[PDB]
Write a protein that binds this ligand. Structure first.
Ligand SMILES: Nc1ncnc2c1ncn2[C@@H]1O[C@H](COP(=O)(O)OP(=O)(O)O)[C@@H](O)[C@H]1O
Ligand SMILES: Nc1ncnc2c1ncn2[C@@H]1O[C@H](COP(=O)(O)OP(=O)(O)O)[C@@H](O)[C@H]1O
Ligand code: ALF
Ligand code: ALF
Ligand SMILES: [Co+2]
Ligand SMILES: [Co+2]
Ligand SMILES: [Co+2]
Ligand SMILES: [Co+2]
Ligand SMILES: [Mg+2]
Ligand SMILES: [Mg+2]
Lengths: 596, 609
């Protein structure tokens, strides 16, 4: 039942023509000026990156041809009356040829050609921003008219003025007295007047350009007072520096409980700092992606797994393949490898923390454990599930209350014969301990992990196996007649509440206790509060004898006592942490009990 | 104190020269192939869109019966991707100018000459070079219509040059063959190509066949008349866009032209939301343009339970068609969508309060989140219109709202009174509600665990302060409010007996309480605990205070406590400690009640003799 029209029927007739690809220059200028970026305001990032590069080139040239130490800076000036934005740098400048060539040719990048000719070890290799040779045109998105004044450091070259409205044509004339470097004046469009506002420009500078190497001045005032901490040697950074830097990058007010300062060169140049905040859950609300100190993404997308989104901080890579918009990354095996690498690194880091300070790590796991569980559930690589699962903490049968263990430790206590991992996911200890399913493998000496946390169950279900070992849920006085009179009677006043009633000798201080056979039911019971309980009675307890003796004497009163015993055992089993519904009834019981 | 170097000092000398902008063509070709689109797969979207526009131009020509379709073929042996449309094709002069010139768009010129149509996708004139992301060799065979014009073959590797030769076996339309580079062989996989078509091009208005098998393309319901869409079509469409297996319980089909062009559909699933999924970062609403998916914010976070689709002709796209421009217009769209959704939900409440109660029960948490996390007061109140409560002035089970509460208020009244309790029996028989019965004010009854937090953050509604019953009771102590006991004097402890009891209680509870006082405001309860800022105290208890214990000297238990303190003083203390614990529980201020149990068991035994 196929329908295909694609058939190999074409044959070349005659001789071929040769052509070269062309460009619709005027339309391309418009696309490059207006259609590259998600935001107009990005022309400021672009113009500042250009000033930086101009300064970096001058710095590079002074290594050999030492000149006059002139200060290396980027000045911005707003004029809210005229509607102008002006930026000036004291860098390398541009003679007439270079203005014509660099500014007049779409995609021509003098910075890229400069980079290509460097020693790979030159400091400038890693800090020159420009590649594509189009960022300058972003100015035309916000300006009706652009004027560029430039003076090169040269053979007494004259200064020049370059000017365009941005519609296919530009003009060049000689000028004086242009200071060494480059001044750019934007005459802002009516709908872009906000960029002649000081406060608005400041917002943009701090967003994208806050860690630019060279001093930025706005109307004569210094902005970028913050050092790119990630580019520094880990041991030259004090804890107070991290605390301040964390607060800044995470927009937080507390301190990091964990700090990881990760540096490496393969698969990419990476300089990074990750923080785990002190404060628990529930814009600066994730790890930012930088490149050569310029923000790429406020919220980095492709470099960390989703389960690590609770990390704050910064990743900077010099050689990460940038999308043309410079707010996205290109699809790349190197970026994928980076994510895998970072995932392993953070895992290793958190593991080391568990050893160094287990108590502190326990606090961490209580607050952030949900992310590990999420990671294990949502990832498809079995090897990855098992790496994240090393971070997991549980409780155990062969261990005291409150004390925690990992799967590896459990794995270390398994007799070399049997090779599978038994767990019981339950609301609490009392419920887990008194599980008939657990009582089975209590006699059969067999350690069982008690998993009390939310989503512990499907975490292990989605985990399936660990350490090539299998995880399987462990779910596969008063005479004797006086008691039976009582049990027959209690079984009637709670017909609509409990499936089963028993007697047990294992009770001491308690008149009764509640047990459950299905942990999944108790959870369904625990979350459903806008079950088949099985209470057991202590025939030696006073309240129970007092009950038996009372059902005949004060039938009304004896049922107050009964429901109290039931509710109390319910509370002991942690199946009723909000006993507000019982209080009035209890106050009635107490009162009737006290005809003293 | 200031450091500037910018000064108006520059002056032009002599004449100027004029210049035309130029382009580094070769590097531009490279930028389109390596740096324009963030994902490689997208070349499929680009070629199919081209095929769609070519068919659209032919469809337009035919106004003044040949099959209009788009065919795809994958050969994993030859490593080829092939697309063929039966559209308008291209002549020599069209082949050279359109394909041979970066930013030249035949499609755009077509649209500019149409002074419907609105279905043409192409404007930038670069989408075609996306083929070089994945192929080191491209062949194009085209046949113009009709027009006594021969076929042609166009060929290039994507660097610098291309060749155009004349050909004979060329069908009306256009055939393009990609010889896939080695790292891109996945696009010779039928299943992979199909994934991509479905992803971006599922609403293209022409049949798409892949290796001879017709793909199940869908109608773009969001662009169609609401009345021409059955419940069944919504069901099916909902299942596609939400990748779900259930059906929508609500459907909002929203169309507007001012202030902004909008074409959208939102659904609320019949399913309860997954609590696991509520905590994940999962996005919920897809964004389209001319029937083509855009990979991208649009809805406030609290509306993330909504599924469906938004399309707006006012959202301009970046060159690679994956970034939305004008972030102020987006927030504006977001603001408009938020308000339209609130209106819709309010109307659903009116239409069917019983169905809305189930919605509020399943999704109420999202409104509560929205109110707590927004800073704008007017936004808080608008969302709060969606909240439901019960009332002391309405029958049990009957739901009401803040606006109906406001509507029943007297002119003189400046407050909205509320009480948080787990259910209506507890609210109605609360010691705190007993106290409020002595005034003539209505009291909202709020049963959900986070209702109180929500009302605390909301703070006021319609210029009226929200006040909890518990708070009001404390405030009355500092006001000359006269209350009378619901039991006559005969049945209460004498003043002298009360002071004596009170003195003994202050001694017996030195550690635990600030004040112990008599209250004339209880009936069936022996005592209560009061705290001025009760709400905030309950919320703070999430991993002591200055509480006050207030006693009902008309309550038999309290009078028995007065007697016990002299007749069996040790039993009195255990009774006193339990009364205090009970009032703490009743106040929702108790810690883990488990250590109270053995104490109570001892107390019970000791009393039953
Ligand atoms: N302020 C400046 N000073 C000196 N040269 C500049 C300046 N701004 C831009 N240029 C030159 O113009 C070229 C094009 O700038 P732009 O379009 O931003 O492309 P790029 O991506 O290379 O920065 C640069 O590579 C550089 O050679
Ligand atoms: N399959 C096709 N049939 C006919 N003409 C085409 C086809 N694909 C591309 N073209 C022509 O080449 C032009 C350039 O295509 P493209 O680079 O995709 O830019 P856009 O689609 O944005 O115009 C199109 O506008 C169209 O005129
Ligand atoms: F200005 Al650029 F890449 F830095 F186009
Ligand atoms: F192919 Al286009 F804008 F659709 F360049
Ligand atoms: Co052949
Ligand atoms: Co080199
Ligand atoms: Co002047
Ligand atoms: Co009125
Ligand atoms: Mg640049
Ligand atoms: Mg196209």
């Amino acid at each position: 039942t196929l329908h295909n029209i694609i058939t190999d029927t074409e044959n070349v007739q005659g001789s071929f023509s040769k052509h070269e690809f062309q460009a619709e220059t005027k339309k391309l200028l418009d696309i490059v000026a207006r259609s590259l970026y998600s935001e107009k305001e990005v022309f400021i990032r672009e113009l500042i990156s250009n000033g930086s590069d101009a300064l970096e080139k001058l710095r590079h040239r002074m290594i050999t041809a030492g000149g006059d130490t002139a200060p290396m800076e980027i000045h911005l000036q707003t004029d809210s009356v005229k509607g102008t934005f002006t930026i000036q740098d004291t860098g390398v400048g541009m003679n007439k040829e270079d203005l014509v060539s660099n500014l007049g040719t779409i995609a021509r990048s003098g910075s890229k050609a400069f980079l290509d000719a460097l020693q790979n070890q030159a400091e400038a290799s890693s800090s020159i921003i420009g590649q594509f040779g189009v960022g300058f045109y972003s100015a035309f998105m916000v300006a009706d008219k652009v004027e560029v004044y430039s003076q090169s450091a040269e053979a007494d070259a004259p200064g020049y003025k370059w000017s365009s409205d941005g519609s296919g044509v530009f003009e060049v004339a000689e000028a004086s007295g242009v200071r060494q470097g480059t001044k750019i004046v934007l005459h802002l469009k009516d709908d872009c007047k906000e960029f002649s506002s000081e406060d608005r420009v400041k917002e943009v500078v701090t967003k994208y350009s806050n860690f630019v190497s060279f001093p930025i001045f706005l109307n004569g005032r210094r902005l970028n007072t913050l050092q790119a901490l990630w580019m520094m040697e880990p041991k030259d950074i004090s804890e107070w520096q991290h605390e301040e830097f964390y607060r800044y990058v995470a927009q937080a007010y507390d301190k990091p409980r964990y700090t990881l300062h990760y540096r490496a060169d393969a698969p990419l140049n990476i300089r990074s700092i990750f923080y785990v905040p002190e404060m628990k859950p529930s814009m600066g609300s994730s790890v930012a992606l930088y490149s050569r100190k310029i923000l790429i993404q406020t919220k980095a997308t492709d470099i960390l797994p989703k389960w690590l989104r609770f990390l704050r901080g910064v990743v900077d890579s010099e050689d990460i393949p940038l999308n043309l918009s410079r707010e996205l990354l290109q699809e790349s095996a190197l970026i994928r490898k980076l994510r895998d690498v970072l995932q392993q690194r953070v895992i290793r880091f958190l593991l080391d923390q568990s050893k160094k300070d287990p108590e502190k790590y326990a606090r961490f796991f209580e607050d952030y454990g949900l992310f590990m569980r999420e990671g294990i559930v949502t990832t498809g690589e079995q090897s990855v599930k098992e790496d994240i699962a090393k971070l997991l903490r549980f409780e155990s049968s062969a261990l005291p209350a409150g004390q925690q263990t990992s799967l590896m430790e459990y794995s270390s206590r398994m007799k070399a014969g049997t090779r599978n991992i038994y767990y019981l996911c339950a609301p609490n200890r009392h419920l887990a301990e008194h599980s008939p399913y657990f009582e089975a493998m209590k006699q059969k000496d067999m350690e069982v992990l008690f998993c009390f946390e939310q989503f512990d169950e499907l975490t292990l279900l989605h985990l399936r196996e660990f350490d090539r070992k299998k995880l399987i849920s462990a779910e596969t006085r008063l005479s004797s007649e006086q008691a039976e009179d009582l049990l027959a009677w209690m079984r009637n006043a709670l017909v609509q509440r409990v499936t089963n009633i028993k007697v047990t000798p294992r009770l001491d201080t308690h008149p009764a206790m509640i047990t459950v056979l299905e942990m999944g039911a108790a959870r369904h019971f625990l979350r459903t509060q806008q079950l088949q309980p099985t209470l057991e009675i202590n025939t030696g307890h006073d309240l129970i004898k007092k009950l038996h003796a009372l059902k005949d004497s004060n039938p009304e009163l004896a049922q107050l006592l009964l429901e109290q015993i039931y509710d109390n055992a319910m509370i002991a089993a942690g199946l009723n942490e909000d006993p507000r519904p019982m209080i009035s009834r209890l106050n009635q019981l107490l009162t009737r009990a006290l005809e003293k």
